[PDB]
Amino acid sequence: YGIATPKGSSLGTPVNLAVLKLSEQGVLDKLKNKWWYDKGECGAKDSG
Amino acid sequence: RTTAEGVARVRKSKGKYAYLLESTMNEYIEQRKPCDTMKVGGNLDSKG
Protein backbone atom coordinates (compact mmCIF):
# COMPACT_ATOMS: atom_id res chain seq x y z
CA TYR A 1 0.00 0.00 0.00
CA GLY A 2 1.43 3.33 -1.06
CA ILE A 3 0.63 6.99 -0.70
CA ALA A 4 0.21 8.18 -4.28
CA THR A 5 0.74 11.61 -5.83
CA PRO A 6 0.08 12.63 -9.45
CA LYS A 7 2.83 12.57 -12.03
CA GLY A 8 5.37 15.37 -11.84
CA SER A 9 4.07 17.09 -8.73
CA SER A 10 5.96 18.93 -6.02
CA LEU A 11 4.73 16.66 -3.21
CA GLY A 12 6.31 13.50 -4.61
CA THR A 13 9.62 13.87 -2.80
CA PRO A 14 8.57 15.27 0.65
CA VAL A 15 5.91 12.57 1.08
CA ASN A 16 8.46 9.92 0.08
CA LEU A 17 10.79 11.12 2.83
CA ALA A 18 7.86 11.26 5.25
CA VAL A 19 6.80 7.61 4.97
CA LEU A 20 10.32 6.29 5.47
CA LYS A 21 10.78 8.58 8.47
CA LEU A 22 7.49 7.35 9.94
CA SER A 23 8.66 3.76 9.44
CA GLU A 24 12.08 4.14 11.07
CA GLN A 25 10.46 5.96 13.99
CA GLY A 26 8.03 3.04 14.29
CA VAL A 27 4.98 5.28 14.07
CA LEU A 28 3.55 3.02 11.38
CA ASP A 29 4.09 0.01 13.64
CA LYS A 30 2.58 1.94 16.55
CA LEU A 31 -0.55 2.72 14.54
CA LYS A 32 -1.04 -0.80 13.15
CA ASN A 33 -0.71 -2.06 16.72
CA LYS A 34 -3.47 0.37 17.72
CA TRP A 35 -6.13 0.31 15.02
CA TRP A 36 -6.32 -3.46 14.66
CA TYR A 37 -5.94 -4.41 18.30
CA ASP A 38 -6.80 -1.58 20.71
CA LYS A 39 -9.97 -0.83 18.79
CA GLY A 40 -10.45 -4.60 18.52
CA GLU A 41 -13.82 -5.95 19.62
CA CYS A 42 -12.04 -9.23 20.28
CA GLY A 43 -10.00 -8.75 23.44
CA ALA A 44 -6.37 -9.94 23.71
CA LYS A 45 -6.65 -12.11 20.63
CA ASP A 46 -2.88 -12.51 20.23
CA SER A 47 -2.63 -13.66 23.84
CA GLY A 48 -5.09 -16.53 23.29
CA ARG B 1 29.86 -9.99 17.22
CA THR B 2 28.45 -10.68 13.74
CA THR B 3 25.71 -12.88 12.24
CA ALA B 4 27.78 -16.08 12.08
CA GLU B 5 28.52 -15.87 15.80
CA GLY B 6 24.82 -15.45 16.46
CA VAL B 7 23.99 -18.61 14.52
CA ALA B 8 26.80 -20.45 16.30
CA ARG B 9 25.36 -19.57 19.70
CA VAL B 10 22.02 -21.10 18.67
CA ARG B 11 23.68 -24.42 17.79
CA LYS B 12 25.70 -24.41 21.00
CA SER B 13 23.29 -23.24 23.72
CA LYS B 14 20.79 -26.02 22.87
CA GLY B 15 17.54 -24.06 22.80
CA LYS B 16 18.46 -21.56 25.51
CA TYR B 17 19.55 -18.82 23.08
CA ALA B 18 17.27 -17.26 20.48
CA TYR B 19 18.80 -14.94 17.89
CA LEU B 20 16.76 -12.09 16.41
CA LEU B 21 17.74 -11.22 12.85
CA GLU B 22 16.40 -10.54 9.37
CA SER B 23 13.72 -12.74 7.83
CA THR B 24 15.79 -13.23 4.69
CA MET B 25 18.65 -14.67 6.75
CA ASN B 26 16.38 -16.65 9.07
CA GLU B 27 15.20 -18.73 6.12
CA TYR B 28 18.54 -19.39 4.43
CA ILE B 29 20.21 -20.59 7.63
CA GLU B 30 17.15 -22.83 8.08
CA GLN B 31 17.70 -24.33 4.61
CA ARG B 32 21.43 -25.07 4.99
CA LYS B 33 23.59 -27.65 6.78
CA PRO B 34 23.67 -28.79 9.59
CA CYS B 35 19.95 -27.79 9.54
CA ASP B 36 19.49 -26.88 13.19
CA THR B 37 17.47 -23.64 13.07
CA MET B 38 13.82 -22.83 12.41
CA LYS B 39 11.73 -19.70 11.90
CA VAL B 40 9.17 -19.07 14.63
CA GLY B 41 6.74 -16.21 15.02
CA GLY B 42 5.71 -13.69 12.45
CA ASN B 43 7.62 -10.80 10.97
CA LEU B 44 7.66 -8.13 13.65
CA ASP B 45 8.34 -4.96 11.65
CA SER B 46 8.51 -4.50 7.90
CA LYS B 47 11.56 -3.46 5.90
CA GLY B 48 12.50 -3.50 2.25
Curated annotation (Swiss-Prot), chain B:
Tissue distribution of the protein: Detected in forebrain. Detected in dendrites of neuronal cells. Expressed in the pyramidal cell layers of CA1 and CA3 and in the granule cell layer of the dentate gyrus.
UniProt subcellular location: Cell membrane; Postsynaptic cell membrane; Postsynaptic density membrane
Binding site for L-glutamate: E22
Modified residues (Phosphoserine): S13
Record's comment on post-translational modification: Palmitoylated. Depalmitoylated upon L-glutamate stimulation. Ubiquitinated by RNF167, leading to its degradation.
Induction info: Down-regulated in the pyramidal cell layer of CA1 in the hippocampus by global ischemia.
Family according to the record: Belongs to the glutamate-gated ion channel (TC 1.A.10.1) family. GRIA2 subfamily.
Note from the entry: The postsynaptic actions of L-glutamate are mediated by a variety of receptors that are named according to their selective agonists. This receptor binds AMPA (quisqualate) > L-glutamate > kainate.
Subunit structure, as described in the record: Homotetramer or heterotetramer of pore-forming glutamate receptor subunits. Tetramers may be formed by the dimerization of dimers. May interact with MPP4. Forms a ternary complex with GRIP1 and CSPG4. Interacts with ATAD1 in an ATP-dependent manner. ATAD1-catalyzed ATP hydrolysis disrupts binding to ATAD1 and to GRIP1 and leads to AMPAR complex disassembly. Interacts with GRIP2. Interacts with GRIP1. Interacts with NSF via its C-terminus. Interacts with CACNG2, PICK1 and GRIP2. Interacts with GRIA1 and SYNDIG1. Part of a complex containing GRIA2, NSF and NAPA and/or NAPB.
Domain notes: The M4 transmembrane segment mediates tetramerization and is required for cell surface expression.
Function text: Ionotropic glutamate receptor that functions as a ligand-gated cation channel, gated by L-glutamate and glutamatergic agonists such as alpha-amino-3-hydroxy-5-methyl-4-isoxazolepropionic acid (AMPA), quisqualic acid, and kainic acid. L-glutamate acts as an excitatory neurotransmitter at many synapses in the central nervous system and plays an important role in fast excitatory synaptic transmission.
The protein, known as: Glutamate receptor 2
Species of the source: Rattus norvegicus
Lineage: Eukaryota, Metazoa, Chordata, Craniata, Vertebrata
Full-length numbering of the shown residues: 705 to 752 of 883
